[model samples]
Target: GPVRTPHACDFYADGTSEAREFATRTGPVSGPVLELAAGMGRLTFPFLDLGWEVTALELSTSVLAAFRKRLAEAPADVRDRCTLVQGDMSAFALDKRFGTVVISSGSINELDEADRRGLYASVREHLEPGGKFLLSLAMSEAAESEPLERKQELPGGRRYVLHVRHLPAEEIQEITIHPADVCTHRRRLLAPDQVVRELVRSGFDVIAQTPFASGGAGRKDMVLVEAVMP
Candidate 1:
């Protein structure tokens, strides 16, 4: 548990320009924002920096622990505008609603079809009237007929190895991360089009699905999907 939690943050703490892009896309949207499946505040910190009142909901204690450490280190004013919520995105009910609901890139990979249906329903219940749902997603464009693996060395001479397998029939990308060769972490990847279809079926008015501008190198495959209640 310990092995997979903190180190994963270290590996992903970079590649965060998309977070700034997400905040920019919100552009004068009203009411407080909610970020679902917010892992280690990759998007939350950037959103907070922009002076938006935001709530971050995450489901992993290990990841939440890492986020708490980071949050505690922020200035008091920035910390004041942020709320950290530990709950399942698939099934959660809070007392208040939000004007904007967002999900960071590739986070939808955490849920299967049933869970995602529940997530849509929950977001529907939690959104203010005319609220928007913004999602940054990585699309599956390149076909990986064979498994791909790579190894990188982290600080302190530790090794982080990643193995990715794409299942074409199921449209799922299976990922296994071995940190320092001592522990392993696994996750899945989903197609953005499939999620867009789900949103339409769940009564969300599909507004826009455009290629996301990463504003940096190495994320050209990402797209941003915007939706709202009908």
Candidate 2:
């Protein structure tokens, strides 16, 4: 398991201040919040602090271990208010639904078109009536045609590179995460508009759609969409 280093997490946390700000903008935090693809409990901790019960779902064992370690260091009350589950977001069902469901930091981009559709449908099924679903997606134009490269600095600093390819007339974008080792790679294809359209088809009312910055040496366009189950 190639877990993102804590240093990388620090940079990610610092780079995306807008996620926290966006959470606050969406009215009061009441009831349970379900976070999909909650890698190492980054955003989960924030919602828990805001007085919302949190259910975090993650698929990676190493990442889950990191989250557990982080949770143990939190105040008892905060840790007590949170629950972690291991499963795939594309096909996980719970005994309970949530008031708000979030898929932040381009987590939605990890799914292919079919899986993305499955994820949207599952989220819809797990949301209570009038509940909100907040998701973030990267725009293809931002990364399409970019070159893959890596940069290094003194004292052991490294930056890996990749590109996001967008298909014509569709929202689907292909992401290729190239590690410092050129031989190691990870790829995901996603369509933001298709996901949104599927949400509507599955009986959700679109609330808001806005762009957010995807932090890095390069600018990655992100869309923050909020929808309510009708």
Candidate 3:
């Protein structure tokens, strides 16, 4: 494979970090769950925070390595509950049985059509009886329909100057309800994540990762993530 550009996800920006106070909100969870492409322990750490045991698989060792650093800092019991392994989603075998399955956004469009279905086939047997297969996705997939080289391309074949921007927590509210957003550093362009929110929210199993280049990179690439639904 060509030395793929290291998307921010490779360093693993805590990968879409998640929540707490769940026992009251939803009974305590007891899970030896299987998470697909668990990048840098995003929900993995949150699961630990809420007392769920996790078996995480991320193909990128770079992503896994970053999670290991955080896991190293966790109190022993939380650390013990997690089992981290690195492998291709469509090929690796798992040890303990997973009561439930999670296919998340880390890598999806990165795969060819056959590979995507193969991933599901590979993990199907791992899901226990009565257990559910949950596909964790984001609201942004609808907008990211075409690849940047296709959608944002100039007639000359040069791709658009891909830009990224950051938004603080308060700024997030502006995006969810009202005006659009901008990256603080590059005021000229729209922040990609915010751009996706306004687009039709496409629901599917395993949203395509930003891999444009944190939690996300190439938003323009994997926007229309979906399953073969009837």
Candidate 4:
């Protein structure tokens, strides 16, 4: 739900910052991963760029159009190791299974309980034996007001405010990259334990929980969940 202000392609075109998460996820495993809702190729490109031979499942073909362009424009070595499929990850399936499946960047929150379970079912079905399922999430462990007046200056030295709001009643969290613009990033927040329970119920053995840093100083709320299919 996040977007780069002033230009749609800034983050999509070059996700060097996001590439690290992929590196982290790949540390314990090798390539041939499948990512769900890989929006604008932020996480998708890095996997392919590093010769991972990855497959991507996206909710929207239009959203993946940017990624398709990146793959096509990329050199053959990087491009050869990539695949794209468009559908809802919760109910989607492929003829092939993968060594790793991703529910990264809070994308799992886009669905409710039943859908989350459905997504887990798909995850189990699509994963190989001893395969891993990795998630990048922000758990609803605490309720605190986010930074309201954060400013980020773009290339021209023009400042843009990254607005934050916590809707406690609605259980919604949101960020507006530019207050002058109506573009806001939002989602129904999730819980770490809840997803872990679902993962267990779906028959995945709990493997690891790795925490990572995002945003500025003194803010550490993001989490990574790893589950393995036996």
The candidate maximizing TM-score is 1
Q: Which candidate number has the best lDDT?
A: 1
* Error in Å for residue 189 of model 4: 0.7
TM-scores of all candidate predictions against the true structure: 0.75, 0.70, 0.51, 0.72
Candidate 2: which pairs clash?
A: none
Ranked by TM-score, the better of candidates 1 and 4 is: 1
Residue 215 in model 4: lDDT: 46
Candidate 4 C-alpha lDDT tens digits along 29-88: 565788898887777776676667778888886788887887788888877777788889
Q: For model 1, how big is the CA root-mean-square deviation?
A: 12.9
Q: Which runs of model 3 end up more than 4 angstroms from their true locations?
A: 1-29, 141-230
After the best TM-score superposition of candidate 4, give how far the Cα of residue 202 lies from its true spot, in angstroms.
Answer: 2.0
Error of 3 at 15 (Å): 6.5
Give the Å error, residue 186, model 3: 18
Of candidates 3 and 2, the better by TM-score: 2
Tens-digit per-residue lDDT, 153-217, candidate 3: 33457556544443411111111122353111111122234323311222123323222212334
lDDT of 2 by residue, 96-188 (tens): 888888887457767766886788788878988778888876656633344445554444366544445443324432233445641223345
Task: Name the runs in model 4 displaced over 4 angstroms.
Answer: 1-19, 25-31, 140-170, 174-186, 215-218
